[PDB]
């Protein structure tokens, strides 16, 4: 409950074999399909036969089966011939204004082939925002070489920073995310109120 | 028994006043003493009353007869002609992989536009030497990655299995009792994984 749900268009035109969702895309969860009406529909009107598909942590008995969402196990049904992959990048279309979150602490690192490096910035248990960096694609690729250095520093040190994100792009890399996740664009080991934050 | 750089390595144009051009290294006396033909060659090429400087000693031209005279480090540098060896030698051996387990990295060594080396050590013994340069060599391109792990294992205990390509031999360290080759791989020791 309270999971960011991928917008219908994040789905890809064809599912992937051997469980190998393609690069820059990732398997859909049981919990995400469920929460997404638009998706369920899509699958229903596009799935023929007595077909069963692999979702990250479960199975989708489509076609003649009705459109059933069976709870599974992480990757445990990757033997099926097709897994449902979602794309991870979304051009939000919002304006590139600055958004910052103070007192945050980079945690839960995520990476993937030819994609982006992300972290979940928490604040007293509770997550707050997710942010990512990637030299590969992205409005802000330039800042990768510079960001990865501060990110790694604060990560292994536990340095309570103040993170800045540009909502111009949205990423769905994490699974069942209680938090949103945008493009990282700055970090600051900061003094309260500092003109430098 | 010090590794004796081969005569072939000898720089026809030695460095002036102890400044052997990047890529080369001043030849020591111990090396010159043990290098038969390099010496013979020397007689055949030093016009009398000419003194050439080595790392330690000096070479009294064949007028004095050709004498390897000891001397402090950098001392012989006072003269205009210094003896140097280029530090890379193409072994011409096959490009196969050889490794040394349970070693530790020590004794870093850097030149200007040449390599970064380290002497790998097992229980006191200097097992092997390995180098990596972003300037010349086969694994020329693997430098930027290797340096990062060389730097880590150096900076912490961390034993290791080092992978070396006897393909090319390096003579960067002076008077060595271990051989040095091109570094191609590092693998932190892991018993369980049957690595070290």
């Amino acid at each position: 409950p309270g999971i960011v749900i991928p917008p219908q268009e994040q789905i890809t035109q064809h599912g992937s074999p051997y469980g190998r969702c393609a690069n820059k895309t990732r398997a859909l969860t049981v919990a995400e399909l469920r929460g997404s009406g638009d998706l369920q529909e899509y699958l229903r009107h596009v799935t023929r036969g007595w077909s069963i598909f692999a979702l990250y942590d479960g199975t989708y008995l489509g076609g003649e089966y009705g459109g059933v969402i069976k709870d599974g196990t992480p990757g445990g049904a990757f033997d099926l011939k097709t897994t449902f992959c979602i794309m991870t990048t979304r051009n939000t279309g919002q304006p590139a204004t600055d958004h910052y979150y103070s007192n945050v602490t980079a945690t839960r690192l995520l990476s993937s082939t030819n994609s982006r490096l992300c972290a979940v910035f928490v604040r007293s248990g509770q997550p707050v925002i997710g942010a990512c960096t990637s030299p590969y694609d992205g409005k802000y690729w330039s800042m990768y070489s510079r960001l990865r250095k501060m990110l790694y520093l604060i990560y292994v040190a536990g340095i309570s920073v103040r993170v800045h994100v540009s909502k111009e792009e949205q990423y769905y890399d994490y699974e069942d995310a209680t938090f949103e996740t945008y493009a990282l664009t700055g970090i600051s080991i900061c003094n309260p109120g500092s003109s430098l934050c | 028994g010090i590794v004796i750089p081969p005569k072939a390595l000898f720089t026809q144009q030695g460095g002036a006043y102890g400044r052997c051009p990047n890529g080369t290294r001043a030849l020591t006396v111990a090396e010159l003493r043990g290098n038969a033909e390099l010496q013979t060659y020397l007689r055949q090429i030093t016009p009398g009353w000419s003194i050439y400087g080595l790392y330690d000693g000096t070479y009294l031209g064949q007028a004095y007869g050709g004498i390897i005279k000891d001397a402090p480090p950098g001392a012989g540098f006072i003269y205009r002609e210094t003896f140097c060896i280029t530090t890379i030698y193409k072994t011409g051996q096959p490009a196969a992989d050889h490794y040394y387990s349970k070693v530790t990295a020590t004794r870093l060594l850097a030149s200007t536009n040449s390599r970064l080396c380290a002497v790998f050590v097992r229980d006191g013994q200097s097992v092997i030497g390995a180098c990596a340069s972003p300037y010349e060599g086969r694994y020329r391109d693997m430098y930027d990655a290797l340096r990062r792990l060389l730097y880590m294992i150096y900076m912490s205990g961390l034993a290791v299995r080092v992978h070396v390509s006897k393909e090319e031999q390096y003579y960067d360290y002076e008077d060595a009792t271990f051989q040095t080759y091109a570094l191609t791989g590092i693998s932190l020791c892991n018993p369980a994984a049957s690595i070290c």
Partner: protein
Amino acid sequence: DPPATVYRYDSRPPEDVFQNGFTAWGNNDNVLEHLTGRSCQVGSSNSAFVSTSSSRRYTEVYLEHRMQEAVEAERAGRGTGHFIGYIYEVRADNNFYGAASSYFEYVDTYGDNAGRILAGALATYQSEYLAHRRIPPENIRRVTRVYHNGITGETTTTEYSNARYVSQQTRANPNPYTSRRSVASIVGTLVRMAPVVGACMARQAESSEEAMVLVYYESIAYSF
């Protein structure tokens, strides 16, 4: 074979050490917080362990650098280049236990995620042995005293021997020290820079004769 003789660098003199020896900072005997530096930090020093090392050369190079420091302090008009350091020699009993082993064993009781890669690389580095509780006079044998005058450039070695020293026929414990998993929060391994020294070592030495800069090995062991 467990070492018989260990060493301890210190800013304390023989007239003190030879009578009272060293007696642990506190009861916290958790092997991880120690090697990790937690139980030897400001407002947190409680290690029931006296840090010593089985390698004299180690203590040697540390003192040799603490001295070069004095020389550089004076150069900045911050001192008089003078330094006096000691290197006590100790007879180890079963009350002495290896730092590394202690580390490894902990990790194989609570699993990989409970330890720290560098905390274990460090124990093996400083060749540390943990004196449980205290290391008393009878175990303290000799003592090299190093004096250096940074201004003359002259070094002056000097030895002394403890009368109270007692000759037993011991060696360190052949068995790993053991403690309940740390419920403490540990960020990394606290270490003093140049040369890299564990916090419980570098820290324990300094006494009554400006805070020590303890850093996270993890933040510096790898480039940026």
